[PDB]
């Protein structure tokens, strides 16, 4: 979008300043209009996490089973205590079997 102005000799510092101002305003707007719930209800947080996981997963080859995997991921994450370390969630890949055959071990 800024290429046409670059081609006509506009000074790049003006473009940089405009980008910085627009980005600051956009970040402030995102923080202002973002939706949050001030109740900490366990059911509500569970549903919010599940919906976020479903939205994240609904572009991959496992999008057909996005509800199953999203629920499993939320269940896996909630049992991490305070550091949410990735190395505390093991992932094992065993060849052969349907996608629904994948399981989460407690």
């Amino acid at each position: 979008q800024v290429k046409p102005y670059v081609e006509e000799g506009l000074h790049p510092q003006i473009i940089i300043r405009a980008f910085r101002t627009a980005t600051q305003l956009a970040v402030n707007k995102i923080k202002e209009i973002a939706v949050t719930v001030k109740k900490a209800d366990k059911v509500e947080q569970r549903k919010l996490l599940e919906k976020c996981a479903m939205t994240a997963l609904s572009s991959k080859l496992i999008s057909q089973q996005k509800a199953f995997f999203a629920k499993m991921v939320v269940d896996a994450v909630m049992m991490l205590d305070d550091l949410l370390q990735l190395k505390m969630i093991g992932i094992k890949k065993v060849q052969g079997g349907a996608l629904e055959d994948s399981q989460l071990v407690a």
Binding site: L61, G96, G97, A98, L99, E100
Partner: protein
């Protein structure tokens, strides 16, 4: 593979399956004279068929989703 006409035999077997409710009617590969696999004792595990269908579907989906090739 048994020498019979594929389309004709398949159509006849499917029509017989639709006529009388009997999902055991198959392709008489050994020419025993009957299409009843229950009477012919042609038995396969349900898990095998389910895994066949599931694996084929998942791999067909995975292959269909690929649209870019970047061989060297």
């Amino acid at each position: 593979n048994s020498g019979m006409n594929p389309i004709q035999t398949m159509t006849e077997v499917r029509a017989r399956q639709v006529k009388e409710m009997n999902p055991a009617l198959g392709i008489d590969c050994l020419h025993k004279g009957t299409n009843d696999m229950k009477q012919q004792h042609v038995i396969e595990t349900l898990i095998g068929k389910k895994q066949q269908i599931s694996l084929a579907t998942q791999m067909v989906r995975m292959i269909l989703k690929i649209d870019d090739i970047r061989k060297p």
